[PDB]
């Protein structure tokens, strides 16, 4: 409805005074001229917005005297006549600062940032003074009442108006200061006092700070055994003679029980996890009829239930983690056991076949120490860990032992920084920098077996155990427990005795790869570097630079067939599942890129070994998007380059099969973080007959 | 089970008290469940809403056992067993306190509870076990200060709990869990007196000194005697040192 009529509008534009109002617009060319009508309420609000923003300009005398509608009976549009006065243009003057001992005239100055001559602006006074939309955020009350200043009071007055200037005086009054002196929680039902009082950031004997208790708050909201809408500090027995506040946390039990579902599709299949898990156990009372209720409840130790699978294995878990061990440091203690069943697959060509497979039981115990005072945000993690592999037909790989069994015993030590401030989900600055260092220990020192000379000993060339003296291909029949050779002629193959001329015999390479790796001896290290930065207004930029490695002391031992870092796909599988590292590329299929035996004349050809070594480098660009509360969607594009080789002989780190792409996430309060993504591989997978390049591939991911 | 389909009054009323007398009080509960409005006011009702009470007490549903009781003292102000229905009641209550580590809530109902029952009614037998019930809930509420008192002194927040331990002592006068308090409000004074600045030391090896003080002087033959006595020789043989 053409509803213009601007009687007066000497110095504020036609332009952004009709945008001014948010609502009740004009008949124009919009999506159906943006419902312009009539509505009573929005007309005054927007009206007052109208005033608001004549007054942002800097005019408090601007004022409306005549705003009118008029129907038109022929045509049936509504004209508004609006008439505005302006007045005189507002500078601020002279905001002098009385009542003030423990900040000087100048700091206060330099906080409140407004200096002689700006334009009138009585909504920023205010905003600078007292904060009222955000608790957080850097006004004059904030300040005085962040240092344990309680019962201060300060009001802006107006003392002179002269010559179209204001003069400010902020009368302020300080009072004594405040101590806590009694400070307990109230409301836990089934979660112990003495979980609840180590994790709490105002204590006794401090002075007053909001941001403490602020902070307190999210930190009791992010424990995970109480509803984060619950806590509700209350300030009791303030007493302003002798400066005393004993505040009271009254806290509401949630529930401990929680299901989780990670994993992801994206063309290989289901490669997720399914967590059941209770964060409020008690070992303390697995004895007690009474408590053991849901199963016991009380300290915050977490006893998770895991079965963690895909189309070729499956792995049951339980793990058992307390957040402070020995009561007096946070050094939190996580113990796991698990077996795992897993059978061949090549992932360049999805085939599962199930009479090769290989199970997995693993025992591991592991403390964290958040490490105090070389610099904050550092985290060191030391675990050891059993494995055993208990191998069945697989004849796969570098495998030779394929119905044998290997020991794993390893120490891992970790130093993990995370700055990545300040939001959680959408990161501006900071960095997330982790080395990691697994070590078993160094055997071929300690044993006297010289490794080299195995295969010339008569305990592992080719004994011929077999008892039936049948045939052979030289014509003779094979005496039982005598040495063999394989001698082929024309073009079947067969064997020989030789009887006693043992060191012209063939070398058993299963028994002598058994030998070689019945107990694993490796070292493995890993780096990653996430390096957040900040362009523009909206683009944030990730690096994501990583590195790998993995060595045997004895070079004549060699590098072991287990723990091999696997490059491609998605990076939604863990160590936990299987024996592999699952680098991420998402221009690729899972785990598609691991080098493979390229000897043709060998009977295995597509068969995957794993890499040794492993250097990935992302850049990825970032705009928020909608990014929210209880919803966070945003877009992502990528630019991967990554590399593996299995033997750092002749490694050429400047291959780097590129992958580029682009997608969004999404993140629900209670749904997790879910995710769609898109990418092209440049590179061919390796073992593929024509070059070609892996085409788009769905990456839906899940974590419911 | 019969009375269960059937509707004869007196034939419920009849086989509930068999089952009462006879010690099966969970399916007497479910009868007079079902007689539960249906039966007051009307004869026998004495008998009534008194064993539906002590069935609830024996079976160990002390929650309903208190509410049934408090509502027969309710009713039936003129009840010749009156007082012993109050003390059953207050008592029932008060087996439903939690550990001391939970939200004491419960223990502050139950007190209140029994604190009327003995204001009312002072004279009887069971007026010695309502004062150990009352004695042992202030000991549970003495015992959850104390133990966040020393909370303190264990995640190595010495100030914190040389301020939480003072306000222990003053708080609850007389307590046997005083001597505890200041033996390890002493400790955390030490702990933060030889750990300090040395701008900052002497004041705080100066606050372990009147907390030995203390210690010793209410009892001089504390249970931590030679324990306290090492501290106290470190705190001398500190301080000597800084004096000019």
């Known amino acids: ?704 | 089970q019969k009375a269960l389909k059937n509707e004869d009054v007196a034939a419920k009323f009849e086989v509930a008290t068999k089952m009462y007398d006879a010690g099966k009080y969970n399916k007497a509960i479910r009868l007079f469940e079902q007689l539960a409005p249906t039966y007051r006011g009307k004869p026998q009702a004495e008998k009534l809403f008194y064993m539906f009470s002590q069935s609830y007490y024996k079976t160990k549903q002390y929650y309903l056992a208190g509410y049934q009781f408090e509502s027969f003292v309710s009713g039936y102000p003129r009840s010749e067993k009156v007082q012993e229905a109050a003390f059953l009641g207050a008592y029932s209550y008060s087996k439903l306190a939690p550990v001391y580590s939970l939200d004491q809530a419960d223990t502050v109902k139950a007190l209140d509870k029994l604190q009327a029952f003995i204001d009312n009614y002072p004279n009887s037998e069971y007026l010695a076990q309502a004062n150990e019930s009352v004695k042992i809930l202030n000991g549970k509420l003495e015992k959850k200060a104390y133990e966040n008192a020393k909370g303190y002194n264990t995640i190595s927040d010495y100030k914190s709990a040389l301020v939480a331990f003072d306000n222990f002592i003053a708080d609850f006068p007389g307590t046997p869990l005083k001597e505890d308090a200041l033996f390890y409000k002493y400790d955390s004074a030490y702990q933060l007196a030889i750990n300090s600045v040395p701008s900052k030391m002497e004041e705080r090896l100066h606050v372990a000194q009147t907390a030995y003080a203390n210690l010793m002087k209410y009892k001089s033959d504390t249970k931590y005697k030679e324990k306290a006595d090492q501290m106290n020789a470190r705190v001398e043989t500190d301080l000597q040192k800084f004096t000019k």
Do not use: C
């Not at chain 1, 004895?554 to 939604?572: H, T």
């Open chain 1, 1 to 704: 409805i053409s509803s213009i009529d601007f009687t007066g509008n000497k110095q504020l534009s036609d332009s952004k005074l009709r945008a001014a109002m948010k609502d009740t617009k004009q008949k124009n060319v919009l999506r159906v001229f943006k419902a312009s009508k009539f509505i009573p309420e929005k007309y005054k609000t927007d009206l007052e917005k109208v005033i608001a923003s004549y007054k942002e300009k800097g005019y408090r005398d601007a004022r409306i005297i005549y705003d009118s509608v008029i129907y038109n009976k022929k045509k049936n549009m509504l004209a508004i006549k609006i008439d505005v006065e302006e007045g005189n243009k507002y500078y601020f003057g002279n905001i002098k600062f009385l009542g003030n001992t423990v900040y000087s005239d100048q700091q206060l100055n330099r906080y409140l940032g407004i200096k002689k001559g700006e334009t009138y602006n009585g909504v920023l006074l205010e905003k600078r003074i007292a904060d009222n939309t955000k608790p957080d955020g850097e006004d004059i009350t904030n300040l005085y009442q962040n240092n344990g200043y309680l019962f201060s009071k300060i009001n802006a007055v107006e003392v002179k108006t002269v010559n179209d200037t204001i003069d400010f005086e902020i009368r302020i009054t300080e009072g004594p200061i405040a101590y806590f002196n009694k400070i307990y929680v109230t409301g836990n039902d089934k979660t112990n006092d003495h979980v609840i009082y180590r994790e709490l950031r105002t204590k006794p004997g401090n002075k007053y700070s909001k941001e403490e208790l602020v902070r307190t708050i999210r930190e009791i909201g992010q424990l995970g055994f109480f509803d984060p809408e619950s806590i509700k500090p209350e300030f009791r027995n303030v007493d302003p003679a002798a400066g005393t506040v004993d505040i009271e946390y009254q806290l509401v039990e949630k529930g401990s029980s929680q299901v989780e579902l990670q994993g992801g599709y994206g063309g290989g299949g289901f490669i997720g996890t399914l967590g059941l898990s209770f964060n409020n156990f008690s070992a303390r009372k697995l004895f007690d009829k009474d408590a053991y209720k849901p199963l016991p409840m009380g300290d915050g130790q977490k006893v998770a239930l895991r079965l963690q699978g895909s189309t070729y294995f499956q792995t049951y878990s339980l793990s058992f983690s307390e957040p402070w061990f020995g009561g007096k440091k946070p050094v939190q203690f996580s113990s796991s056991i698990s077996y795992s069943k897993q059978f061949n697959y090549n992932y360049s060509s999805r085939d599962v076949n199930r009479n090769q497979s290989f199970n997995i039981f693993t025992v591991q115990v592991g403390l964290a120490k958040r490490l105090t005072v070389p610099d904050d945000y550092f985290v060191l993690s030391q675990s050891v860990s059993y494995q055993h592999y208990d191998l069945n037909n697989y004849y796969t790989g570098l495998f030779t032992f394929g119905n044998g069994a290997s020991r794993n015993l390893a120490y891992t030590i970790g130093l993990s920084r995370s700055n990545k401030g300040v939001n959680p989900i959408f990161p501006t600055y900071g960095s997330e920098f982790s080395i990691s260092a697994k070590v078993t220990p160094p055997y071929s020192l300690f044993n006297n077996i010289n490794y080299g000379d195995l295969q010339n000993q008569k305990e592992y060339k080719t004994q011929y155990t077999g008892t039936t003296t049948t045939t052979g291909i030289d014509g003779q029949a094979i005496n039982p427990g005598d040495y063999t050779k394989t001698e082929t002629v024309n073009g079947q193959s067969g064997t020989v005795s030789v009887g006693s001329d043992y060191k012209s015999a063939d070398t058993d390479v299963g028994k002598v790869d058994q030998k070689k790796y019945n107990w694993l001896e490796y070292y493995k290290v890993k780096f990653k570097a996430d390096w957040y930065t900040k362009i523009y207004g909206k683009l944030v930029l990730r690096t994501l630079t990583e590195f790998g490695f993995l060595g045997a002391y004895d070079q004549s031992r060699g590098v072991v067939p287990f723990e091999r870092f696997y490059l491609g796909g998605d990076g939604m599988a863990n160590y936990s599942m299987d024996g592999r590292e699952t680098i991420q590329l998402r221009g690729y299929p899972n785990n598609s890129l691991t080098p493979i035996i390229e000897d043709r004349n060998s009977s295995r050809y597509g068969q995957q070994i794993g890499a040794t070594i492993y250097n990935k480098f992302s850049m990825e660009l970032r705009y928020p998007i909608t990014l929210k509360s209880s919803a966070s969607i945003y877009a992502l594009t990528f630019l991967e380059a990554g590399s593996s080789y299995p033997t750092f002989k002749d490694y050429n780190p400047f291959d780097l099969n590129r992958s580029a792409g682009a997608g969004l996430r999404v993140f629900m309060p209670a749904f997790g973080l879910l995710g769609i993504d898109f990418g092209y591989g440049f590179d061919a997978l390796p073992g593929s007959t024509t070059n070609k390049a892996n085409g788009w591939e769905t990456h839906f991911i899940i974590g419911f």
